């Protein structure tokens with residue numbers, strides 16, 4: 013159980029959600045399991061979606077549990093020139109299947125947040 | 132001028148004095164000019180200091196003169212003269228513009244040339260205009276010369292349709308090739324926004340003398356390209372190409 | 381399957397298979413270049 | 423058609439194709455890049471040497 | 472184990488255990504008794520399944536569509552003799568080269584799995600298949616369709632062999648029919664439809 | 675390692691220091707050092723003779739057909755004559771100097787450096803060795819001394835190998851090509867370029 | 880004239896005429912003898928070729944004067960002598 017905790021879409025104090033996840037998949041599918049929104053204001057049909065690809069519209073910001081993810085690819089190094097070193101793409105990235113005793117906290121899509129004003 | 136002496140002499144003492152020494156050697160002249168038109172441009176695109184690029188662009192247009200000296204017709208020889216005039220204009224003006232833009236920036240390699248359009252507009256305008264002229268663009272006199280050269284080659288009597296088409300093809304590749312290396316300079320040296328080149332020092336648009344020189348050389352280009360017959364006052368070709376025109380082969 | 385291949389590899393069985401191929405080859409050549417008393421190529 | 427969506431495991435892959443195409447601008451565009459403007463760039467070097 | 476057997480109530484051979492797609496315990500002579508030959512033969516049956524599938528498409532579909540009036544394709548039987556834009560020999564030679572390229576690389580993968588799947592020129596064109604005989608990759612899986620869960624591929628591959636077996640019989644059907652009957656395959660169908668109890672092998 | 679046969683592994687002895695080590699020696703022809711050491715030069719001397727040799731065959735027939743100059747076919751060159759050249763004496767003459775240069779090279783491989791410590795003056799320095807057996811560059815054999823002997827030797831010899839390996843094949847082409855076509859090599863090219871699908875070795879037979 | 884072509888698919892007819900400057904090719908060259916008016920646009924002020932931000936007048940002078948470095952090495956030698 014790679015226990016995950018989402019800091020969702022900045023709201024007043026926090027906007028935390030909780031989710032118990034068995035590691036092994038990517039971040040995209042493991043989020044779309046716990047039904048928490050990742051693709052910002054991006055809809056089903058064709059708008060910046062379909063997983064493991066180009067556009068890069070999922071920019072999850074990792075705060076706690078960073079030393080449990082797969083290492084960064086070079087596509088992440090490419091599509092994230094604007095990044096602070098913190099966040100990654102989460103659409104080409106995986107959590108270890110053997111890390112069933114992890115503890116990871118994630119803030120969802122940035123550029124729609126006003127935070128680090130907290131803690 | 133000094134380049135065009137090599138063509139005037141070739142017209143005057145070779146085609147007028149040694150016909151059966153020139154009529155059995157015209158096709159190789161045509162072939163050499165045809166391959167030159169593309170070779171000069173293909174090596175121009177490779178250079179990196181725009182002065183040598185302008186030099187090679189001047190080299191390239193000297194293939195139309197060659198192909199017009201061969202392909203023995205009235206217009207092929209006659210279109211060559213219009214070409215030497217419309218190039219003595221354009222190449223001279225382009226070298227003047229290159230030497231005037233430089234000596235203001237002191238950078239010769241085409242990679243560090245920032246956005247010079249912001250400080251000095253008029254140079255940019257009169258440079259793009261003559262680049263268009265050198266592109267054989269219609270209206271300006273860089274077009275009708277090449278057009279008459281094509282017409283002279285096509286209607287030539289000393290050819291039967293086998294090279295009269297392949298040579299025209301390899302000649303027309305020049306129109307695909309020349310803008311690739313002219314606009315590649317126009318884009319690196321003028322477009323783009325360089326540093327905030329606000330200090331009006333070592334950066335001043337062309338004054339009255341240079342601007343008047345540019346305009347006074349430009350106006351003949353338009354005047355000839357609109358109504359070329361201001362340089363077709365040539366009735367010697369009706370006797371110059373009279374000797375050659377029946378003996379063997 | 382292994383035992384079949386091994387048996388097919390014993391000496392007499394190869395011999396007929398090898399020589400049979402050799403006989404076929406020579407017969408074909410004599411059918412295409414018959415009488416062949418000299419080697420007139422070079 | 424979200425509750426009993428049968429082929430979501432397959433359909434999305436079609437998505438993973440179609441978008442990946444349109445963002446790649448109809449790969450024919452990249453073709454002229456990796457052929458023409460990289461062919462002449464070597465041809466000039468060759469005719470220089 | 473309890474999978475259907477070709478001969479119900481018989482004891483299937485031990486080396487056939489139902490793992491492979493299309494394993495109905497059929498091997499009376501034990502051609503695949505040893506594991507290695509089985510491995511090679513699995514490929515043999517696999518490719519034969521694909522060639523005939525095109526051949527069945529190659530024979531029956533045109534002869535069908537030319538039997539009705541839509542096209543002009545001649546008999547497959549005399550298809551070889553026809554004279555196309557050049558001599559047959561060179562085309563066969565050209566066929567020898569290009570096929571030898573794939574029948575060369577495929578050969579390398581067979582003798583040594585996984586050592587051939589990267590493009591010799593543009594090395595980012597690597598192929599995705601892992602099972603021998605299932606190359607995968609963007610050339611051979613333009614959308615995937617092979618990368619799935621088991622019990623689905625086993626279904627799908629069995630849907631690939633079971634059709635292929637259907638082809639190889641059919642093309643040898645079109646083979647012998649054209650020899651001892653004088654017409655195309657579709658005529659042999661129709662003349663069998665007018666008087667099913669009379670017009671057969673027994674003329 | 676990019677051998678010649680992608681699936682096949684390269685043999686254990688073609689480690690790869692020799693330029694052009696594309697793991698290719700199927701018949702077990704180089705599984706002994708002293709064998710392999712003497713085989714490398716053969717490829718080096720063969721290829722160099724086969725580099726110039728094709729050009730002499732090629733260039734001469736190219737200039738003749740176009741019309742710039744005139745020369746007989748390389749096939750027809752053996753019987754050519756201008757003056758003071760008995761093919762008897764030339765054979766002896768060529769056998770002499772070639773005999774001289776070939777041997778002193780042979781003595782170099784047999785005994786490295788035992789070729790530039792002698793009496794005869796003014797030249798006893800260059801013909802020592804290039805420091806690499808098949809590359810005897812010296813300040814006479816490399817009058818534009820333009821080598822560093824180590825670095826480019828991996829990256830430039832690999833050009834001269836793959837250059838030669840191609841050139842040795844090409845010459846083998848003309849011999850067979852002239853053997854069947856009875857004509858010049860470019861003539862073979864010019865004929866085939868005319869109707870490629872009808873001018874082929876299938877038609878030549 | 881006004882020839883009337885009845886083409887096989889439409890309804891044409893045309894009218895043409897030949898024209899050419901008779902000899903005014905002399906008068907236009909005489910008018911373009913306005914280069915003798917290239918003297919009013921030369922006595923005008925120069926943009927910066929006379930500006931204080933300019934000294935050295937060759938074609939490489941200001942650009943490649945650039946050997947006060949030698950004079951500076953010499954001044955260094957002199958200062959060392961001091």
Ligand code: CLA
Nearest residue numbers: 640641643644645647648651652659660662663670671672
């Ligand atoms: C897909 C397979 C298939 C099909 C649908 C047919 C169908 C037909 N064949 Mg045929 N045939 C086949 C395979 C097939 N054959 C094979 C493999 C051979 C080589 C031995 C032949 C050799 C052959 C000859 C020589 C003749 C026919 C003829 C005929 C027609 C009349 C039936 C008859 O007398 O032949 C009976 C068929 C056989 C004795 C051989 C059949 C062999 C197959 C493999 C048996 C199993 C069939 C298969 C399980 C059916 C699948 C079920 C369903 C999909 C239909 C009929 C349209 C005759 C004709 O033209 O009629 C006027 C005729 O003269 N066939």
Ligand SMILES: CC(/C=C/C=C(C)/C=C/[C@@]12O[C@]1(C)C[C@@H](O)CC2(C)C)=C\C=C\C=C(C)\C=C\C=C(C)\C=C\[C@@]12O[C@]1(C)C[C@@H](O)CC2(C)C
Nearest residue numbers: 498499500501502519522523526529530547550639640642
């Ligand atoms: C039937 C067949 C193989 C059958 C094998 C059998 C029964 C073996 C059975 C057994 O081994 C087992 C299973 C188990 C053992 O214990 C028992 C036995 C019983 C021993 C192969 C056919 C294989 C049939 C094939 C491959 C057909 C290919 C068609 C091709 C190539 C295309 C041809 C064309 O191009 C031409 C020629 C001309 C064009 O005009 C037209 C087209 C059609 C386009």
Ligand SMILES: CC(/C=C/C=C(C)/C=C/[C@@]12O[C@]1(C)C[C@@H](O)CC2(C)C)=C\C=C\C=C(C)\C=C\C=C(C)\C=C\[C@@]12O[C@]1(C)C[C@@H](O)CC2(C)C
Nearest residue numbers: 699700701703720723724727730731748751842843845846
């Ligand atoms: C030297 C050479 C040619 C030199 C040509 C010369 C001098 C030409 C001279 C002339 O034209 C001129 C200049 C002018 C003319 O007027 C006179 C002549 C005389 C006509 C060709 C070599 C040609 C040599 C060749 C092609 C060698 C090929 C060898 C192969 C393929 C061997 C492969 C293998 O050995 C390996 C590599 C590994 C093993 O395990 C496997 C096998 C297969 C055994």
Ligand code: SF4
Nearest residue numbers: 063064065066068103
């Ligand atoms: S991968 Fe790139 S494209 Fe596919 S979903 Fe994540 S962001 Fe959208």
